Design a protein around this ligand. Structure first.
Ligand SMILES: CNC(=O)c1cnc(Nc2ccc3ncsc3c2)cc1N[C@H](CO)Cc1ccccc1
Length: 281
């Protein structure tokens, strides 16, 4: 299903894996462990990720991507087996990550509430496809929600994904986004819902999940500040938008709040998350 790319072709298309940043006219876009490069395969802009348990994540990415094709999931175009390093070739996402756009990285305009709602719905549609096809992402975060030309949400990074409550040694994921049970080693699609709840807070507030120079350092702690009636979600709403109405903001917050139940069985399933997000608009 995928194009097997030659290592010489990938070296050629990335200007010999030019490590200089894009900003400076280089090909390095980021750093997923390995470096992500901008490439041109004929007239097509691509993203080339040049990478023991790394070969496991490489195989898992191809395996999951072969089985999963959806409007709200990134597309793997091919890979490279021959040559010095393992490479993964993806479709270029012109608007990068939701994290980058929420942070207005490189002077991009803030996302409107209207775009944020479409992104929240799209990401939820992508998680629903994964859960319907018995996959647990395990690393749902704003950096893993990529954005195309129409700002369509595309879930990325399937290297840590697991088939679907089992427990494991070797706990993986991003702490600021992880459910309590996932931090304990449990493998459940219910952990993906918790991480999506944190993403919804990042969407409402424009705040990153973790900031060492902030009080509270962790975004999920704002839920407790709001719950303990110290503050309201209105005091946290991203100020970089002109179209956020109180009713739809509270509706998104109620969905995030439900996602963020510390008790995995009290959290809604992705299908309930989709329904509540569609009712919101
Ligand atoms: C302005 N546009 C971009 O910067 C951009 C364009 N296409 C991308 N494609 C793509 C699609 C699936 C995928 N799966 C794994 S890496 C990967 C890449 C990613 C992009 N940004 C991303 C986020 O900043 C770079 C990136 C940096 C560090 C780690 C991983 C990715």
């Amino acid at each position: 299903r995928f194009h097997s790319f030659s290592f010489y072709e990938l070296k050629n298309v990335t200007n010999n894996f030019d490590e200089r940043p894009i900003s400076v006219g280089g090909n390095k876009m980021g750093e997923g462990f390995g470096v992500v490069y901008k490439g041109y395969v004929n007239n097509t802009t691509v993203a080339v990720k040049k990478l023991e348990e790394l070969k496991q994540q490489f195989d898992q990415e191809i395996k999951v991507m072969a089985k999963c094709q959806h409007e709200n999931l990134v597309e793997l175009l091919g890979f490279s087996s021959d040559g010095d390093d393992l490479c993964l070739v993806y479709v270029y996402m012109p608007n990068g990550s939701l994290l980058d756009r929420l942070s207005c990285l490189d002077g991009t305009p803030p996302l409107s509430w209207h775009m944020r709602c479409k992104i929240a719905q799209g990401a939820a549609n992508g998680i629903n496809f994964l859960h319907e096809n018995h996959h647990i992402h395990r690393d749902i975060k704003s950096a893993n929600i990529l954005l195309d030309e129409a700002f369509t949400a595309k879930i990325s990074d399937f290297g840590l994904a697991r088939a679907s409550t089992v427990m494991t040694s070797r706990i993986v994921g991003t702490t600021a986004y992880m459910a309590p049970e996932a931090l304990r080693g449990e493998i459940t699609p219910k952990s993906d819902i918790y991480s999506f709840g944190v993403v919804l807070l990042e969407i409402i507030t424009g705040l990153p999940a973790v900031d060492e120079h902030r009080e509270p350092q962790l975004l999920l702690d704002i839920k407790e500040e709001i719950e303990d009636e110290e503050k309201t979600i209105e005091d946290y709403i991203d100020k970089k938008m002109n179209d956020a109405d109180s009713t739809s903001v509270e509706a998104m917050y109620s969905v995030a709040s439900q996602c963020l139940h510390e008790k995995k069985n009290k959290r809604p399933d992705i299908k309930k998350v989709q329904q509540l997000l569609q009712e919101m608009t």
